[PDB]
């Protein structure tokens, strides 16, 4: 019944935005749509994060179908602009890709999210 | 045409148009580009696959078992098994089931007397999962090929502890594991297991 | 069946688990009457949670799930169709097709 | 004609935002050139292709008629209205230009 | 150190203040200072790269102009890639102005990584002193009352110290693991400091070396503002609404507050569906998942005060008051005169010791100085919010 399922709750929102400002300062978070599809479409997405407040909604449900397509999970966020100061931007962001790089600080808290994403799904 | 971007070939007789293995893309394909002794998948019988979720791999199961053999695909999503549904529209030995193999018989009727499964699933319950596809459909002494993921199934246990108790899981439903494998370097932590399900001498 | 939308009729209520006009109504001729509390008039079943639903429709008759009567299924599909004497009209893998992937179009229904 | 004809209305039943953004010609061609709508949603902006024109118009009217080909993939019932207005996005950028 | 010895909550009367919104020539205000003597002052920053001087102390009628200063694309940084930034001049965002509490000196600051200080009566630069640093865009100042104590802070986690008088460094506190947005500081040698997004907020001994830690934890995200009313205790307002009193018995807050402004502007399901089906329209809606909290955009308490006043894009500037035990704060009212983005917010006093004569001047934008950060906002213009308050 809805379509911008699942959506995720608030605390566990807040531990996805730390995620995505730690992945953004690790530069390893490939913001928005047009590096999520390139990202997913590589094979080097581990998962997505999105806003669904967004306009129109289904901008990002590209992300849902891809995601079951190549094992990758995503979820839904209540917040664009906290999830715009999540990326660090002025602008409020309703997507944002966690990517694969050996090179990572956040190696172990990406994975713990995806854990909690995962159950979600 | 490709079904996801593989690159087929094509030779001439007096056209074949041999679509080409990744086995990256599939367990299945990673566990024939490992080397296999005895496969249960055949040019001629039926068999049932578990976890096909598009033709990543089921493409080339239906490859396999050809002109004569059938296959039947077990999902449950929309819209990867959209994908089966007119991807299945050109090959006939394709038929998916959207039911949740938790219960195998809530669709009983629409396969009779299966010969071969194959796991490839995410799921914890991966032995009970297959064991009540197993008990009901499959052919006395027709085998099981398992694709386990160790990080999915049980991910806080060591390594070969994971393969190690579900052989046994397999081995208390008269599932007798022929051989083992891992894939490593085409999958890293994974494995294929090779058994055939007995019934009638088990030691 | 008189149409092959009669058997997404009738797997619309076995993926469900619900008995429809027809699995009521050939047992009513093929299982008669006998008593209620004792000496079942008694059916081996393969699916559990339809039993309930069975024995709804029927009062005195014993319905089983057990692995002997999984066995005995079974191995009617291992001996296929053959102990059917002439009465499968047509094959049973022609209707497999048409019914898995019909009752595929109608639970992914687009 | 004809067949022109009743292009043109499945393409303003099934995808609208296709046929709001760019017109029925580029959107009815569009579903063959991916193969399929299904393989244009998870195709970029980038790894589209349509027809300083080319360098900018090519890439951000790609961004919106992909964005519509989503909104027609996932919907069951799409909208006429919404591709009007994701077509008004590129109208702003083609004042620009 | 000093208490909370005044108790005048009760005499100010909202519904019968003057709200006023004035007309300004500038753009995207991003700060309010006000200046009291111990005539009245006001000073501004604006996005056009602009120093205004306006004058507030006719409470009668709205501020009248005095003076301006606009800086420009013509400051460039004549090098690109040095260790100095001393042009006199903005090139880019400015973040805050600051008047002395002696108001003979007056520095902005902001992405320029400059805090370049002016005289105040010819509107002519009198130095500038750069942080010598790439990431360390300072954002917000605290001046330290009846002194030159000038406590910054910056982006690359630095809470810098100067006297104006001198033209000198004294010294640079470090612990903050994200960035500093607001400070605010006292007559003492303490200041409060808050964190970007780590919610570590430290009420800071300035010569001792030492730093407290406030966390607190809809759900939050950030500390947004946070002023200085006592010695003991302070106020954060955070982006989840979450207003807490704080004090120095727990690392707990001594009063937890929920959503003030009240609730987000629930999105338009004609712009987030487009679905020609409605019943769909309301189904990516979320129902109550998807409803959102407004933050404070300020949090002002005049010093040594039961009152505290809150601000935000709903358009109402909400002021509380804190009662006689110390332990809570209470709604007072509501100020509706403007809205839009309120940035910063300073009231200057007159009269006698018994009738406190006050003007509100709260910034009033589009977007805020640190960021856009804005969604269907209603009814906003830039300007100047002045209140006139007696009683």
Known sequence: ?????????????????????????????????????????????????????????????HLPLLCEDKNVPYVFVPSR????????????????????????????????????????? | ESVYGEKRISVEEPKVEYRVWNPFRSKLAAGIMGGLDELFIAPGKKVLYLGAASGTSVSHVSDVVGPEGVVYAVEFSHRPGRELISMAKKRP?????IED????????????????????????????????????????????????????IDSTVDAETVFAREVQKLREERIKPLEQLTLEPYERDHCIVVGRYMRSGLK | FKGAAEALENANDISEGLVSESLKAILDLNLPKASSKKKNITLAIS???????????????????????????????LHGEKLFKGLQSGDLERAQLGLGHAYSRAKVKF | ??????????????????????????????????????????????????????????????????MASRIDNYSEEPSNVFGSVLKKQVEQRLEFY | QGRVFRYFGDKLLISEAKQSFTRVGENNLTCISCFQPVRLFAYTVSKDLQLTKYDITDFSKRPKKLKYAKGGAKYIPTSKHEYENTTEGHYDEILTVAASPDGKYVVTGGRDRKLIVWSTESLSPVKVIPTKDRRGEVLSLAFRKNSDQLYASCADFKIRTYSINQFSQLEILYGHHDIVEDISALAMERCVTVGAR??????????????????????????????????????????????????????????????????????????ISGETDEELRKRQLQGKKLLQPFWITSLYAIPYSNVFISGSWSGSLKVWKISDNLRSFELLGELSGAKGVVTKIQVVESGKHGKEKFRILASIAKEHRLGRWIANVSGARNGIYSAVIDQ
């Open chain 5, 198 to 271: 780590d919610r570590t907020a430290m009420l800071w001994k300035i010569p001792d070396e030492t730093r407290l830690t406030f966390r607190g934890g809809f759900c939050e995200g950030s500390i947004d503002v946070v002023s200085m009313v006592d010695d003991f205790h302070f106020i954060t307002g955070s982006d989840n609404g979450n207003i807490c009193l704080w004090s120095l018995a727990k690392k707990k807050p001594i009063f937890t507050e929920r959503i003030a402004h009240g609730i987000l502007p629930e999105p338009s399901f004609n712009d």
């Open chain 2, 101 to 152: 193999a938790r219960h195998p018989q809530k669709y009983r009727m629409l396969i009779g007397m299966v010969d071969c499964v194959f796991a490839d699933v995410a799921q914890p319950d991966q032995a009970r999962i297959i064991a009540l596809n197993s008990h009901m459909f499959l052919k006395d002494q027709g085998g099981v090929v398992i694709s386990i993921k160790a990080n999915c």
């Open chain 3, 47 to 77: 699916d559990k949670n339809l039993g309930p639903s069975i024995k709804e429709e029927f009062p005195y008759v014993d319905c089983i799930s057990n692995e002997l009567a999984q066995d005995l299924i079974r191995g009617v599909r």
């Open chain 1, 1 to 61: 019944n809805p379509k911008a399922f699942p959506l995720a709750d608030a605390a566990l929102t807040q531990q996805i935005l730390d995620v995505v400002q730690q992945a953004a300062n690790l530069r390893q978070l490939k913001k928005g749509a047009n590096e999520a599809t390139k990202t997913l479409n590589r094979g080097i997405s581990e998962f997505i994060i999105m806003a669904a407040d967004c306009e129109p909604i289904e901008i990002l449900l």
């Open chain 1, 81 to 121: 602009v906290a999830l715009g100061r999540a990326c660090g931007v002025s602008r409020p962001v309703i997507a944002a890709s966690i990517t694969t790089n050996d090179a990572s600080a956040i190696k172990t808290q990406i994975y713990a999210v995806k854990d909690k994403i995962e159950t979600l799904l």
């Open chain 4, 1 to 66: 004609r004809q067949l022109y004809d009743y292009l043109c209305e499945k393409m303003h039943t099934v995808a609208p935002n296709l046929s709001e953004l760019i017109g029925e010609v580029i959107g009815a061609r569009l579903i063959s050139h991916a193969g399929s709508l299904t393989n244009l949603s998870k195709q970029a902006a980038s790894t589209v292709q349509i027809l300083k024109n080319k360098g900018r118009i090519s890439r951000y009217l790609a961004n919106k008629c992909s």
């Open chain 2, 93 to 97: 030995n394709i038929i998916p089931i």
